[PDB]
Design an enzyme around this catalytic site. Sequence first.
Site, PDB file in Angstrom:
ATOM      1  N   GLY A   1     -32.824  33.295   1.457  1.00 61.73           N
ATOM      2  CA  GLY A   1     -32.169  32.411   0.494  1.00 61.73           C
ATOM      3  C   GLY A   1     -30.678  32.296   0.787  1.00 61.73           C
ATOM      4  O   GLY A   1     -30.293  31.983   1.916  1.00 61.73           O
TER       5      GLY A   1
ATOM      6  N   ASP B   1     -33.131  46.960  11.560  1.00 60.18           N
ATOM      7  CA  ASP B   1     -32.403  45.767  12.012  1.00 60.18           C
ATOM      8  C   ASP B   1     -30.889  46.031  12.015  1.00 60.18           C
ATOM      9  O   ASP B   1     -30.097  45.240  11.485  1.00 60.18           O
ATOM     10  CB  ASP B   1     -32.758  44.542  11.143  1.00 60.18           C
ATOM     11  CG  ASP B   1     -32.160  43.237  11.669  1.00 60.18           C
ATOM     12  OD1 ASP B   1     -32.034  43.060  12.905  1.00 60.18           O
ATOM     13  OD2 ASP B   1     -31.813  42.380  10.829  1.00 60.18           O
TER      14      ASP B   1
ATOM     15  N   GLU C   1     -22.050  44.955  -4.383  1.00 54.12           N
ATOM     16  CA  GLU C   1     -20.593  45.058  -4.390  1.00 54.12           C
ATOM     17  C   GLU C   1     -19.979  44.117  -3.357  1.00 54.12           C
ATOM     18  O   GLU C   1     -20.604  43.795  -2.343  1.00 54.12           O
ATOM     19  CB  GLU C   1     -20.140  46.498  -4.120  1.00 54.12           C
ATOM     20  CG  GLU C   1     -20.350  46.979  -2.693  1.00 54.12           C
ATOM     21  CD  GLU C   1     -20.093  48.458  -2.547  1.00 54.12           C
ATOM     22  OE1 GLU C   1     -18.968  48.892  -2.893  1.00 54.12           O
ATOM     23  OE2 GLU C   1     -21.011  49.177  -2.086  1.00 54.12           O
ATOM     24  N   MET C   2     -18.744  43.699  -3.628  1.00 48.84           N
ATOM     25  CA  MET C   2     -18.003  42.806  -2.746  1.00 48.84           C
ATOM     26  C   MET C   2     -17.346  43.618  -1.625  1.00 48.84           C
ATOM     27  O   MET C   2     -16.572  44.540  -1.885  1.00 48.84           O
ATOM     28  CB  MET C   2     -16.945  42.035  -3.543  1.00 48.84           C
ATOM     29  CG  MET C   2     -16.280  40.892  -2.788  1.00 48.84           C
ATOM     30  SD  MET C   2     -17.421  39.598  -2.267  1.00 48.84           S
ATOM     31  CE  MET C   2     -16.268  38.456  -1.509  1.00 48.84           C
ATOM     32  N   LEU C   3     -17.670  43.254  -0.386  1.00 42.63           N
ATOM     33  CA  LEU C   3     -17.186  43.931   0.813  1.00 42.63           C
ATOM     34  C   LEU C   3     -16.306  42.972   1.625  1.00 42.63           C
ATOM     35  O   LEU C   3     -16.035  41.858   1.184  1.00 42.63           O
ATOM     36  CB  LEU C   3     -18.392  44.414   1.624  1.00 42.63           C
ATOM     37  CG  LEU C   3     -19.279  45.452   0.931  1.00 42.63           C
ATOM     38  CD1 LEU C   3     -20.565  45.676   1.711  1.00 42.63           C
ATOM     39  CD2 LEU C   3     -18.543  46.770   0.752  1.00 42.63           C
TER      40      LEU C   3
ATOM     41  N   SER D   1     -32.831  33.252   5.728  1.00 38.05           N
ATOM     42  CA  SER D   1     -34.244  32.960   5.486  1.00 38.05           C
ATOM     43  C   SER D   1     -34.633  33.320   4.054  1.00 38.05           C
ATOM     44  O   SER D   1     -35.258  32.526   3.357  1.00 38.05           O
ATOM     45  CB  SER D   1     -35.116  33.733   6.478  1.00 38.05           C
ATOM     46  OG  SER D   1     -34.737  33.439   7.816  1.00 38.05           O
TER      47      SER D   1
ATOM     48  N   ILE E   1     -20.956  32.111   0.441  1.00 37.24           N
ATOM     49  CA  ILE E   1     -20.409  32.966   1.515  1.00 37.24           C
ATOM     50  C   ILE E   1     -21.435  33.377   2.579  1.00 37.24           C
ATOM     51  O   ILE E   1     -21.084  34.069   3.538  1.00 37.24           O
ATOM     52  CB  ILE E   1     -19.732  34.241   0.947  1.00 37.24           C
ATOM     53  CG1 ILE E   1     -20.691  35.033   0.047  1.00 37.24           C
ATOM     54  CG2 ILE E   1     -18.472  33.864   0.182  1.00 37.24           C
ATOM     55  CD1 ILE E   1     -20.259  36.459  -0.190  1.00 37.24           C
TER      56      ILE E   1
ATOM     57  N   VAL F   1     -26.342  33.711  -0.335  1.00 34.99           N
ATOM     58  CA  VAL F   1     -25.440  34.767  -0.816  1.00 34.99           C
ATOM     59  C   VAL F   1     -24.137  34.131  -1.303  1.00 34.99           C
ATOM     60  O   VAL F   1     -23.561  33.285  -0.613  1.00 34.99           O
ATOM     61  CB  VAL F   1     -25.126  35.803   0.282  1.00 34.99           C
ATOM     62  CG1 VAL F   1     -24.198  36.894  -0.249  1.00 34.99           C
ATOM     63  CG2 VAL F   1     -26.418  36.404   0.828  1.00 34.99           C
TER      64      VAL F   1
ATOM     65  N   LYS G   1     -26.894  37.903  -4.016  1.00 35.55           N
ATOM     66  CA  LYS G   1     -27.920  37.355  -3.133  1.00 35.55           C
ATOM     67  C   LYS G   1     -28.983  36.621  -3.964  1.00 35.55           C
ATOM     68  O   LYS G   1     -29.723  37.253  -4.714  1.00 35.55           O
ATOM     69  CB  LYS G   1     -28.553  38.479  -2.299  1.00 35.55           C
ATOM     70  CG  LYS G   1     -29.722  38.045  -1.424  1.00 35.55           C
ATOM     71  CD  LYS G   1     -29.967  39.018  -0.281  1.00 35.55           C
ATOM     72  CE  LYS G   1     -31.411  38.982   0.199  1.00 35.55           C
ATOM     73  NZ  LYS G   1     -31.556  39.443   1.610  1.00 35.55           N
TER      74      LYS G   1
END
Length: 342
Positions: A38, A154, A106-108, A36, A32, A40, A55
Amino acid sequence: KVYNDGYDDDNYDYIVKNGEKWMDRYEIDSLIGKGSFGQVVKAYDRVEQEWVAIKIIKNKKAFLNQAQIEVRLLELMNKHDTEMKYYIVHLKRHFMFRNHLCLVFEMLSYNLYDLLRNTNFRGVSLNLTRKFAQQMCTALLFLATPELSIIHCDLKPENILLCNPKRSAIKIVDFGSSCQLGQRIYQYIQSRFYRSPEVLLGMPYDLAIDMWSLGCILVEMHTGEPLFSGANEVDQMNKIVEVLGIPPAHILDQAPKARKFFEKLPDGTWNLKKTEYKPPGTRKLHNILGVETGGPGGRRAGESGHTVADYLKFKDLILRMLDYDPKTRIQPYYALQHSFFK
Ligand SMILES: CN1C(=O)[C@H]2CCC[C@H]2N(C2CCCC2)c2nc(Nc3ccc(C(N)=O)cc3)ncc21
């Protein structure tokens, strides 16, 4: 021939396979995200019985060590926000798997850039922008907790995600570039569009740079376009100057990189160097917002909550967030008590 016995590629990343089951627990669905750091990955946690975002850091010392710094800050934030009411993403746990560090978040839902893409970059309402702004100011107030004193460093629309696709609740993500307040180590920081003038001028900085970025973000959520879309640091500074005018003399006198964008005259005043641009402070936010002309592109004319009175409260809040001086720039606490949030 092979990297990590055939689990890695030449980029030091884990070769994610569909339907693979790690550690008799996490069932890998699909890729998904990419970066840089790695990768996710979306996966079903069979123990907790829920979807999660994992991640997977590159199998390389640099990214591992940087990710452990991120793990430290996330776990530090979690013990101060245990009930999860300050809108920071929740690191649930982490583990090592075939030499890759794996952070379980957690899944967002969709990010705020994906929301803007659905509008064809025409933007969302002032009501939905208010709900995002309230939440981000609360999040920034939590980052200002003196034991934390965390700079996200950021903030941008792609690093702000919704909890559920059918609700306005948000969470800030990606603390890879984040650090706590300290002595100045880093200078090339933040994504360029959301980069504070102090960073651009090579000056000292603190938590106020995130409030700058927030200011830039909230305008972008309503108009749909970035407020300052600089192709480089010079263009970035010139696009800020168009809206906010030339920075004050006392700031520029103290700026190591003032000569990059500005030119000191014999009298002691600062002008722009010619590199095209509207004169200083003549592309007004009042007109960008469309305070009196029914909002951005007149598209909000007749909509409830989009009056001159409502737009002025938003305008005023944003000009305090986009204050050139970081020491008098509005802080999370006072920003939450602004008329706009009544
Ligand atoms: C399914 N999905 C998406 O479709 C989109 C949503 C907009 C961004 C996408 N991502 C990841 C893209 C790579 C970093 C975030 C998603 N992130 C998450 N959770 C998540 C939260 C924080 C972090 C982190 N870097 O700290 C990673 C993943 N949950 C769902 C998710």
